[PDB]
Amino acid sequence: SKTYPQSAGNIRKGGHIVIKNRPCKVVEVSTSKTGKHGHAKCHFVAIDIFTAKKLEDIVPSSHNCDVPHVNRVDYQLIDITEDGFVSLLTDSGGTKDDLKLPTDDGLTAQMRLGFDEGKDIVVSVMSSMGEEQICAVKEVGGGK
């Protein structure tokens, strides 16, 4: 549900893969084969999409990898609570309130300032495997 199975031989540089239960972006793919009659193994180098740590795997080309779904969604900012939660407006007219201000000080200052200023602030959220990160902030209008 958070992942789908795909043969290692179909994984490409720039795609994603699960290594040690971590969603990673594939930065290097190479293959090796045992002699003339072997079956290729895929050697992956990948970068954890939240922690930026490098992880690696060697997988037979014919075995499945778990591939994580990775989404990027924009929301309008409708609140920053005094305890650091963020309230986001959903495309169905709902609210998404489970996220906090990002650890990035630039992104947080942009959100807080834009909100204090009465600006229309759009927040990009990257999500994978039940984990979410505010990854961009822009103003699109408004003001006081």
Swiss-Prot record:
Polar residues: bias regions: 1-9
Post-translational note: Lys-36 undergoes hypusination, a unique post-translational modification that consists in the addition of a butylamino group from spermidine to lysine side chain, leading to the formation of the unusual amino acid hypusine. eIF-5As are the only known proteins to undergo this modification, which is essential for their function.
Principal location listed in the UniProt entry: cytoplasm
Keywords for this protein: Cytoplasm, Hypusine, Initiation factor, Nucleus, Phosphoprotein, Protein biosynthesis
InterPro entries reported for this sequence: IF5A-like, IF5A-like_N, NA-bd_OB-fold, Rib_uL2_dom2, Trans_elong_IF5A_hypusine_site, Transl_elong_IF5A_C, Translation_prot_SH3-like_sf
Deleted gene: phenotype: Severe defects in plant growth and development. Delayed dark-induced leaf senescence. Dwarfism, defective sporogenesis and shorter primary roots. Impaired protoxylem development.
Tissue expression pattern: Ubiquitous. In roots, expressed mostly inside the stele of the mature zone.
Molecular function in Gene Ontology: mRNA binding; ribosome binding; translation elongation factor activity; translation initiation factor activity
Family statement drawn from the similarity comment of this UniProt entry: Belongs to the eIF-5A family.
Function: Translation factor that promotes translation elongation and termination, particularly upon ribosome stalling at specific amino acid sequence contexts. Binds between the exit (E) and peptidyl (P) site of the ribosome and promotes rescue of stalled ribosome: specifically required for efficient translation of polyproline-containing peptides as well as other motifs that stall the ribosome. Acts as a ribosome quality control (RQC) cofactor by joining the RQC complex to facilitate peptidyl transfer during CAT tailing step.
Protein name: Eukaryotic translation initiation factor 5A-2
